[PDB]
Amino acid sequence: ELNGVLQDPDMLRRPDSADFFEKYIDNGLVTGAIPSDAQATQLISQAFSDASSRAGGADFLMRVGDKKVTLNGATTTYRELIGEEQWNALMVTAQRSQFETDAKLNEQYRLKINSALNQEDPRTAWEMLQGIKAELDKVQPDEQMTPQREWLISAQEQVQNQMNAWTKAQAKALDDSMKSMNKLDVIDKQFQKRINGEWVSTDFKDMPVNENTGEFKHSDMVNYANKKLAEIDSM
Amino acid sequence: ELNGVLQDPDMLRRPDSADFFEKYIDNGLVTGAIPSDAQATQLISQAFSDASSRAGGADFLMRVGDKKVTLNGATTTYRELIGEEQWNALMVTAQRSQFETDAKLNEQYRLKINSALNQEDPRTAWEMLQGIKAELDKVQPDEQMTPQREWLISAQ
Amino acid sequence: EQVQNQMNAWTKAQAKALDDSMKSMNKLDVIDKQFQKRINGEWVSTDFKDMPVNENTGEFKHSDMVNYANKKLAEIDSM
Amino acid sequence: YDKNVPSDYDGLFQKAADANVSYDLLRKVAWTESRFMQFTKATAKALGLRLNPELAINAAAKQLAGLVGKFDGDELKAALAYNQGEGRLGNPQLEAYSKGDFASISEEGRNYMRNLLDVAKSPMAGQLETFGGITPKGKGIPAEVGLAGIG
């Protein structure tokens, strides 16, 4: 009789099924349909295990764990019938069960995660990962540490480790293009010390070298030669 | 009735909730509200499992494990009702539960750790790691070997 | 999710193979531009050791002129 | 990675450019693209009408004026329309931004908004600032505060 409005995996996440369960248990305890408080407890602990191992259950549970029920004379909230620790375990299970009850969700999320760790730009993997963390909050609405929230953590702390290498490969690319500008600057300084009346050679094999420039090739003068003429033409 | 001043995760770490729990159990045993010493024990062992699996519980437990309670005629300290070994397990659980009850803390600490292993200068990663070891002592105030104190050890 | 990790490397090895064959086309384009600036009446050398170099071309080898030389003659023959 | 304390020619110019939007935003929109307006697209220079701070900041101030004026209360929508134009690519996003469907805007518009909402003011600010937290009560970390010291 509970599988009438607590099985359709779209009828759980509705916000009335919580009220339906509260009214079921209450009117069963009052109107004799549920006689014994040692039996309403079994109905609770079996309906919660039906609704936890089923897609759509985490939010039904998080909604019902705030409704009031009166058992054994003492009135309480369903998060407190079951202990705090046991409710934590329950919500963890209710969130992570919809990822091993259907393998389509597991496939889909794992492939988006992995195709998000393989984007070339590490900064454009992070918005993909916030996308994944945004489509996890639609299936797991409680803050426990489900194993999928471990996929996302390893993905983020893997993209950081990827950026530690991508930045090293960008600094090695601004090292070989600041050398090739240092060389043109020193060649210009040599030409200018030779023009203004000072006796220093201007062959490319006689420039100074200081580990910001490296050894001078011939093509680092051709480049300079076509670039003074280009600049003098533009004046 | 204990969830009135022992659930608000900021009302645990206060230093009076320890006194509230001590007075609750004492005045329950004396004034009949808690009749049986075989029942005050269940109240202890259920309030400690409520307060251990909850953010803010490690320091409430470390504060209450020094208050005096008298059960079965023999008077003792709550660290000694529950055994030494069982109290160690209890405090370990109370420290590491606030990192798998909320995933924001787990995310945040793991990302600071990993972005501290990726700093270029190894000498400037160490002060980041002392920073992390300084923001762990605000959530785990007992010296047991929680798994987060294993993150920091592997990081160093 | 292992084949994805394999394609992240196979694509890197295909982009490094379209980097060494777009260089060898940049060099023929710049050599043609040099010959054309020299023909239309401008004083710029056409030796392979005096072309410009901009990290899209690299250093010019001798065989990057032979290749060009057999390719203008091949194109002029086909007109 | 950025602050409002260091002042240079940028803060010297946007004091009047904002008078001809917001000085805090216009100082920030330029910083993210050209460290201290970087209209890199050739069509953006032919449409916006170069490398001169007398008109570059004046071009951004004019566009960001209309972009922050096309709704008059959505400044994050303005920053989004800036680097994502309203032709053939931004239209599917801008109609998906107001409905709160940030999972379907872009990989670049979100990263752009998430870097500039700390100085910008929108009604959807606190709704994107928590768009992708690890838990629905959490806050999703933008690209350059999780990748802070890595360099």
Side-chain angles (χ1 to χ4, degrees), chain A, chain B, chain C, chain D residues 2 4 6-9 11 13-14 16-17 19 21-35 42 44 46 48 53 56 59-61 65-66 69 73 75-151:
Chain A
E1 177 207 352
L2 261 177
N3 291 6
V5 293
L6 261 67
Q7 190 172 45
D8 206 37
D10 49 307
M11 203 35 73
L12 281 167
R13 62 177 61 92
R14 295 272 324 263
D16 67 57
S17 276
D19 273 3
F20 172 93
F21 193 64
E22 184 181 4
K23 283 311 184 174
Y24 181 63
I25 287 298
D26 273 357
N27 289 12
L29 287 167
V30 158
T31 77
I34 304 171
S36 169
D37 286 7
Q39 201 209 336
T41 293
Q42 286 216 300
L43 268 45
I44 290 154
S45 157
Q46 168 192 248
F48 282 169
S49 154
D50 266 345
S52 87
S53 277
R54 167 175 299 153
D59 58 359
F60 162 65
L61 260 58
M62 207 182 43
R63 203 156 279 96
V64 70
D66 278 7
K67 302 317 220 73
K68 289 299 203 106
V69 77
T70 296
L71 278 195
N72 290 148
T75 184
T76 188
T77 71
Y78 287 73
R79 200 175 189 202
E80 292 171 348
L81 280 190
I82 327 172
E84 195 68 46
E85 184 272 335
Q86 300 286 146
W87 182 260
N88 271 348
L90 187 67
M91 271 308 300
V92 171
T93 304
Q95 292 152 314
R96 97 185 172 202
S97 298
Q98 55 178 342
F99 280 106
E100 76 180 1
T101 288
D102 48 355
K104 303 184 304 307
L105 265 162
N106 203 348
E107 194 209 354
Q108 156 170 314
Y109 274 63
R110 289 190 64 186
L111 292 199
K112 269 200 290 167
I113 287 310
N114 199 357
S115 162
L117 300 193
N118 286 183
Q119 294 284 158
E120 173 59 287
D121 205 347
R123 278 83 59 89
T124 199
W126 257 69
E127 197 56 36
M128 295 201 64
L129 278 196
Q130 316 313 90
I132 304 306
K133 297 205 287 182
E135 277 99 14
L136 265 193
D137 315 340
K138 280 171 160 46
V139 314
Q140 311 180 4
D142 214 341
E143 304 105 15
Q144 283 74 2
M145 197 62 188
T146 52
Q148 292 78 62
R149 302 199 164 94
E150 190 72 342
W151 295 342
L152 268 298
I153 286 309
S154 276
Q156 291 183 304
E157 86 167 4
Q158 180 71 229
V159 170
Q160 279 178 8
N161 280 335
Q162 268 197 7
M163 189 170 175
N164 182 37
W166 179 89
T167 290
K168 183 155 225 179
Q170 293 285 303
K172 187 182 167 302
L174 280 192
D175 264 359
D176 298 19
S177 300
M178 201 158 157
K179 279 172 165 57
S180 158
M181 195 51 187
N182 272 337
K183 285 149 135 171
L184 303 185
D185 273 4
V186 66
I187 287 177
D188 160 75
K189 183 195 61 178
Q190 277 290 112
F191 269 25
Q192 276 296 323
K193 275 157 57 65
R194 171 77 185 258
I195 282 188
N196 289 345
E198 298 138 10
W199 312 109
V200 71
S201 40
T202 80
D203 200 9
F204 75 87
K205 305 183 301 304
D206 284 339
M207 310 303 198
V209 165
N210 74 330
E211 175 52 4
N212 298 8
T213 62
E215 191 95 349
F216 289 73
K217 304 167 317 165
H218 180 241
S219 194
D220 266 321
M221 184 91 65
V222 185
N223 272 335
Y224 171 88
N226 309 309
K227 207 168 61 43
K228 296 302 288 194
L229 295 180
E231 164 198 357
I232 294 179
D233 284 7
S234 70
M235 269 177 174
Chain B
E1 177 207 352
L2 261 177
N3 291 6
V5 293
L6 261 67
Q7 190 172 45
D8 207 37
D10 49 307
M11 203 35 73
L12 281 167
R13 62 177 61 92
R14 295 272 324 263
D16 67 57
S17 276
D19 273 3
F20 172 93
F21 193 64
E22 184 181 4
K23 283 311 184 174
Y24 181 63
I25 287 298
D26 273 357
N27 289 12
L29 287 167
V30 158
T31 77
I34 304 171
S36 169
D37 286 7
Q39 201 209 336
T41 294
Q42 286 216 300
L43 268 45
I44 290 154
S45 157
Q46 168 192 248
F48 282 169
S49 154
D50 266 345
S52 87
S53 277
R54 167 175 299 153
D59 58 359
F60 162 65
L61 260 58
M62 207 182 43
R63 203 156 279 96
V64 70
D66 278 7
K67 302 317 220 73
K68 289 299 203 106
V69 77
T70 296
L71 278 195
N72 290 148
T75 184
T76 188
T77 71
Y78 287 73
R79 200 175 189 202
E80 292 171 348
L81 280 190
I82 327 172
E84 195 68 47
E85 184 272 335
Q86 300 286 147
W87 182 260
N88 271 348
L90 187 67
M91 271 308 300
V92 171
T93 304
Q95 292 152 314
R96 97 185 172 202
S97 298
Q98 55 178 342
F99 280 106
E100 76 180 1
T101 288
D102 48 355
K104 303 184 304 307
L105 265 162
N106 203 348
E107 194 209 354
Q108 156 170 314
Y109 274 63
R110 289 191 64 186
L111 292 199
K112 269 200 290 167
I113 287 310
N114 199 357
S115 162
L117 300 193
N118 286 183
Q119 294 284 158
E120 173 59 287
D121 205 347
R123 278 83 59 88
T124 199
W126 257 69
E127 197 56 36
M128 295 201 64
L129 278 196
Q130 316 313 90
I132 304 306
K133 297 205 287 182
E135 277 99 14
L136 265 193
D137 315 340
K138 280 171 160 46
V139 314
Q140 311 180 4
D142 214 341
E143 304 105 15
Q144 283 73 2
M145 197 62 188
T146 52
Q148 292 78 62
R149 302 199 164 94
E150 190 72 342
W151 295 342
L152 268 298
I153 286 309
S154 276
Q156 291 183 304
Chain C
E1 86 167 4
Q2 180 71 229
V3 170
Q4 279 178 8
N5 280 335
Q6 268 197 7
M7 189 170 175
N8 182 37
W10 179 89
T11 290
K12 183 155 225 179
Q14 293 285 303
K16 187 182 167 302
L18 280 192
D19 264 359
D20 298 19
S21 300
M22 201 158 157
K23 279 172 165 57
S24 158
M25 195 51 187
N26 272 337
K27 285 149 135 171
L28 303 185
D29 273 4
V30 66
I31 287 177
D32 160 75
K33 183 195 61 178
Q34 277 290 112
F35 269 25
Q36 276 296 324
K37 275 157 57 65
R38 171 77 185 258
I39 282 188
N40 289 345
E42 298 138 10
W43 312 109
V44 71
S45 40
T46 80
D47 200 9
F48 75 87
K49 305 183 301 304
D50 284 339
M51 310 303 198
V53 165
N54 74 330
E55 175 52 4
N56 298 8
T57 62
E59 191 95 349
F60 289 73
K61 304 167 316 165
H62 180 241
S63 194
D64 266 321
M65 184 91 65
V66 185
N67 272 335
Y68 171 88
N70 309 309
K71 207 168 61 43
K72 296 302 288 194
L73 295 180
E75 164 198 357
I76 294 179
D77 284 7
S78 70
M79 270 177 174
Chain D
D2 191 9
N4 284 177
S7 316
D8 271 316
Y9 83 105
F13 202 98
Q14 322 284 350
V21 192
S22 189
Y23 160 76
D24 316 329
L25 179 76
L26 269 295
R27 170 174 171 80
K28 213 51 63 173
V29 56
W31 194 99
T32 303
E33 322 169 31
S34 43
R35 305 158 198 170
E75 189 209 5
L76 271 291
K77 173 250 202 186
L80 177 66
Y82 194 75
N83 70 289
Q84 306 261 309
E86 322 205 0
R88 165 80 81 66
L89 176 47
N91 315 117
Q93 320 182 5
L94 270 299
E95 84 200 90
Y97 155 80
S98 279
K99 322 198 297 281
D101 179 20
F102 313 94
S104 81
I105 170 174
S106 177
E107 272 299 284
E108 310 72 38
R110 264 185 288 154
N111 213 328
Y112 189 79
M113 276 171 323
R114 267 214 175 81
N115 294 324
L116 318 181
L117 72 95
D118 59 356
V119 310
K121 295 180 176 66
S122 171
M124 292 62 69
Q127 205 176 27
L128 184 137
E129 180 280 323
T130 184
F131 158 67
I134 185 66
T135 48
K137 262 163 43 64
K139 312 294 193 179
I141 297 191
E144 282 283 328
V145 294
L147 308 170
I150 288 175

